[PDB]
Design a protein around this ligand. Structure first.
Ligand code: HEM
Ligand code: HEM
Lengths: 145, 145
């Protein structure tokens, strides 16, 4: 159950999550766009799922693309603000889960964001330790899918 | 025009939005739910627009309500973090506007949030001045609908 996954995150994991976010979270626009671009380069099989953002090949030049990147970056903020409160975290996750459930975004498909995240983290000098911690947070969302 | 409305966010209004947000921003969950409850009490003809939310009359108790309440509060935060860059502000508003357009929410309906906000602000000791400043920000989204 979602609650089980949320209550999982330990003090160590929660600490590493906030520690890294403090950086990658400082530039949601610059960092958010990078994550989206990376996911499009490594996972070209997900480009059609964003036919709304038009030509994701534009990057920062794409108005729609930027909107999603910036908006997506904020989505993570909400999860990073409800780490000390499983009750709240679950409610927040379940909400965002609805939008993903209607988009036919299976748990496996959602796990595709792990590749890009790890890259964006390494670019800042965040070894796996941090990459693994982020994976745990992502799992919480998959549990609701 | 979105570009026109956003151009109404002078330095004075920008400062007022941040000065107030700092307070109401401290409690997105507590304040978020309050805004929703006040909106459902002052505007009953807007309850059917949240069928998925289930029983709103439940208040904080309702998990679905809190989830959308906390998430909604974050939406405002994103808009405040873009007050510096008009270009980015629009890209964010347009993105959120698309969600209201597909929901059948016209400028009129949306504008139904000015009442609650004004009430929530007063409870914190923020007269009109602040209530009006927020109206300008809300207007930007109203022009994208
Ligand atoms: C860190 C992980 C992720 C976060 C925080 C996230 C967050 C978001 C948010 C906040 C939205 C807007 C929801 C709406 O307004 O309906 C969204 C939309 C969307 N996301 Fe998830 N997402 C993530 C991963 C993914 C992945 C891995 C995929 C696909 C493989 C995906 C596919 C989509 C699509 C297709 C949309 C709709 C875009 C549009 O048409 O506006 N996302 N995402
Ligand atoms: C400050 C003003 C508001 C903000 C920042 C805001 C923000 C949000 C956000 C971020 C969402 C989630 C979008 C998604 O995942 O699709 C949402 C959903 C929604 N909003 Fe707006 N909203 C505002 C005012 C209103 C008003 C006044 C109405 C109706 C009169 C409204 C109707 C809805 C509905 C029906 C949903 C979908 C709820 C659900 O089924 O989960 N919103 N809002």
């Amino acid at each position: 159950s979602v609650y089980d996954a949320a209550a999982q995150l330990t003090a160590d994991v929660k600490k590493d999550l906030r520690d890294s976010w403090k950086v990658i979270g400082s530039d949601k626009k610059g960092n958010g766009v990078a994550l989206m671009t990376t996911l499009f380069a490594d996972n070209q099989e997900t480009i059609g799922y964003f036919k709304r953002l038009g030509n994701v090949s534009q990057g920062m030049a794409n108005d729609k693309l930027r909107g999603h990147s910036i908006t997506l970056m904020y989505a993570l903020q909400n999860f990073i603000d409800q780490l000390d409160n499983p009750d709240d975290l679950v409610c927040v996750v379940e909400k965002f889960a609805v939008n993903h459930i209607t988009r036919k975004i299976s748990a496996a498909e959602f796990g595709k964001i792990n590749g890009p995240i790890k890259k964006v983290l390494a670019s800042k000098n965040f070894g796996d330790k941090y990459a693994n911690a982020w994976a745990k947070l992502v799992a919480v969302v998959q549990a609701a899918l």
